Design a protein around this ligand. Structure first.
Ligand SMILES: *[C@H](N[C@H](CO)C(=O)O)c1c(COP(=O)(O)O)cnc(C)c1O
Ligand SMILES: *[C@H](N[C@H](CO)C(=O)O)c1c(COP(=O)(O)O)cnc(C)c1O
Ligand SMILES: [Mg+2]
Lengths: 410, 410
């Protein structure tokens, strides 16, 4: 009935709920959060300014806010096995900024994964505060295997002499060896920071090795595979680092935290501590593998590194369509959303790319299994193969509606 | 019933809803958002990654997100009379960071209001990124009048030669002359940034003259007097500056925006565009004047600057209780929340202070008027006079309960 006061706004919110229902979401970073997560960030906790930390706030009337934030901190520590957690970062990007501010100074040398191989903007892009403030040098995957080569990264680190190595990626499909990253860091006297945003849910589910025992500091989004609200999180085992991180988040970088979003983080972290989260992770892994297998067996398509051991994979589409932007646009026509993506050693424009990135988390959260995941990948191959046949795309779009009706979003 | 799964979290949220109902909220930054604002940030908009700007997103299936974000932008532009708006900043601190990144360089000199006279942490505190990155040199209020002296500030600017002047405050009761601030900036070829976070509601209601025609760039929180969700907003009339601001917010400082929060910004901005919002502003002014008048007349209390023309005022409490912190602790015992606050030329430790800060927006949103405001101020005078008479406090707590039951929070 507040809806009656603002139809243009509430019409658009209702349309987005229906678009999410009627579309197959394969964007590897996306998920479907619980009713409980959305309800928690729709609470009157937005009415309370909580500058500072539990028991050490700028203002009064914060005793109950302190219970909520302490639940989020304790559940993070328990879930990831860390001695310290900071649940205030507004975003993964703000989490990363606080860690740089805590460990290094402006102009220090940092190594981060190449943006074409899956490094984030905040891992040294020149258009990011990261690239503008610090001296980032990128490491890549091997050109032939498309795998991290820890011997090559070591040789580069001994030349570059970084103060900090950043590990973690948004387009890398294989198991990262975090013990090797920390061995590299230790060999050159560098800090190791792991941004586990993409894989945090699989770390929580037991399906990906934890960086937490190896990274001086671990950052993540609470969204993506962890299936939480949009925000950031920082972990460490080192009490002196924890004090600097806390001061860097507030008052270094942010002011008041979003305590309604932190309530939602507490909700999501308790959902990830449930035994049912292990089964989620297992279905995320099986579902992503079942899609990759369709592309591996098709002669016209190549999966980057030959497959996946996580939630995502990339496909070189350039034997079937001109570039990944074309592939993204064709699949959108049949109500399948994914993103064009640069492949390692990408030769085409970053606006076009050679690739698509596919993820399983959102379709897994809707209850889909291996048979549905395989059928979705068969529709992708068929749509790209027949991109100039409207009657084909029309039929695939109608088949997609039967599957979305069968696996309702909420 | 999702709440059965997590009673510790949902019991804490019920405990905060009761705490807010049974508390008289005088923290001058606090407010009571509409059910519509909370509902918008509890939507499945949290599921969509919207890196980029409307029509220029990193990913597809963003055409409905684009309508929502464009409503927030169009409403900010219409409400404040600005040619350009950015609704993505996660916070007021993030909005300010993007403006500095757009207009100046590290090491550049900036003038901002002294932190003791109500400058924000992000206006050059040494523990903020603001003081760490830029050379902040404060202007103060007149020691006698506790007013801004535009002649004194002009002389200081001619001597310091800042690249940027920051105006706006968290603890200043009087009308800030934005036309004079622009004259001062113009005299030295500085940019003028106004942070209107505390007064944006009064600007929107017509009760404070707008900085928007005078500042090169205006920042604000969407929360505080504007009565929106927690977040930031940037306004400018200069198209070249607007492009720099857009790049600085993303990919300069942030990654994906909180589109659920942006929907709530669009909701709050439509509310502020309503004729009822003028009546809200009217009552905020009246209620604050009413409380200020009680302290003005009582002989044991001085109001800083001797009164208010906005939503807040400060009171020197040191003749009645040892320090502002003691006053905060005592009023907490009778279910009245405000904060200890430094006064101009504060002499005591920042952890104690001589002052309390009081504002009207929250009690005004609960539907209270001049009578209840006068009454609340009488209760505050009485509790502080009788601070070690346990039975006087207990009886005030009871009178407070009658008022809170009379004006239900929701
Ligand atoms: C509000 N913050 C002050 C501390 O609450 C206050 O006294 O009211 C404020 C901001 C807040 O930015 P965040 O959203 O916390 O990052 C920024 N600018 C000004 C002038 C404020 O008053
Ligand atoms: C998410 N990054 C990309 C877009 O979502 C992606 O390709 O998946 C991400 C972040 C995001 O931080 P924000 O909350 O948007 O600031 C940070 N770090 C990594 C590794 C990501 O994948
Ligand atoms: Mg506080």
């Amino acid at each position: 009935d507040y809806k009656a006061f603002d139809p243009e706004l509430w019409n658009a919110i209702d349309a987005e709920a229906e678009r999410q229902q009627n579309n197959i979401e394969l964007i590897a970073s996306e998920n479907v959060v619980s009713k409980a997560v959305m309800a928690a960030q729709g609470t009157l906790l937005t009415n309370k300014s909580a500058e500072g930390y539990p028991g050490k706030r700028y203002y009064g009337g914060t005793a109950v806010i302190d219970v909520v934030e302490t639940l989020a901190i304790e559940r993070a520590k328990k879930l990831f096995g860390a001695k310290f957690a900071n649940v205030q970062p507004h975003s993964g990007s703000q989490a990363n900024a606080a860690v740089y501010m805590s460990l290094i100074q402006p102009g220090d040398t940092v190594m981060g994964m190449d943006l074409s191989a899956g490094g984030h903007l905040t891992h040294g892009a020149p258009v990011s505060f990261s690239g503008k403030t610090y001296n980032f040098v990128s490491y890549n995957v091997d050109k032939e295997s498309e795998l991290l080569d820890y011997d090559a990264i070591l040789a580069q680190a001994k030349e570059v002499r970084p103060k900090l190595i950043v590990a973690g990626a948004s387009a890398y499909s294989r198991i990262i060896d975090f013990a090797k990253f920390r061995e590299i860091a230790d060999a050159v006297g560098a800090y190791l920071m792991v941004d586990m945003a993409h894989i945090a849910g699989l770390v929580a589910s037991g399906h990906h090795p934890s960086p937490v025992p190896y990274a001086h500091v671990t950052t993540t989004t609470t969204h993506k595979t962890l299936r939480g609200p949009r925000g950031g999180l920082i972990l460490t085992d080192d009490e002196d680092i924890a004090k600097k991180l806390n001061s860097a988040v507030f008052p270094g970088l942010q002011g008041g935290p979003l305590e309604h979003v932190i309530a939602a983080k507490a909700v999501a972290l308790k959902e990830a501590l449930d035994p049912a989260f292990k089964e989620y992770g297992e279905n995320v892994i099986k579902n992503a593998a079942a899609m990759a297998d369709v592309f591996n067996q098709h002669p016209d398509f190549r999966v980057i590194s030959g497959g996946t051991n996580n939630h995502l994979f990339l496909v070189d589409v350039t034997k079937v369509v001109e570039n990944g932007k074309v592939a993204q646009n064709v699949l959108e026509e049949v109500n399948i959303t994914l993103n064009k993506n640069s492949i390692p050693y990408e030769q085409l424009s970053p606006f076009k790319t050679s690739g698509i990135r596919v993820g399983s988390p959102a379709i897994t959260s809707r209850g889909m299994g291996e048979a549905e995941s395989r059928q979705i990948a068969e529709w992708m191959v068929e749509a790209l193969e027949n991109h100039d046949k409207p009657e084909v795309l029309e039929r695939i779009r109608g088949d997609v509606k039967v599957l979305t009706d069968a696996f309702p979003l909420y």
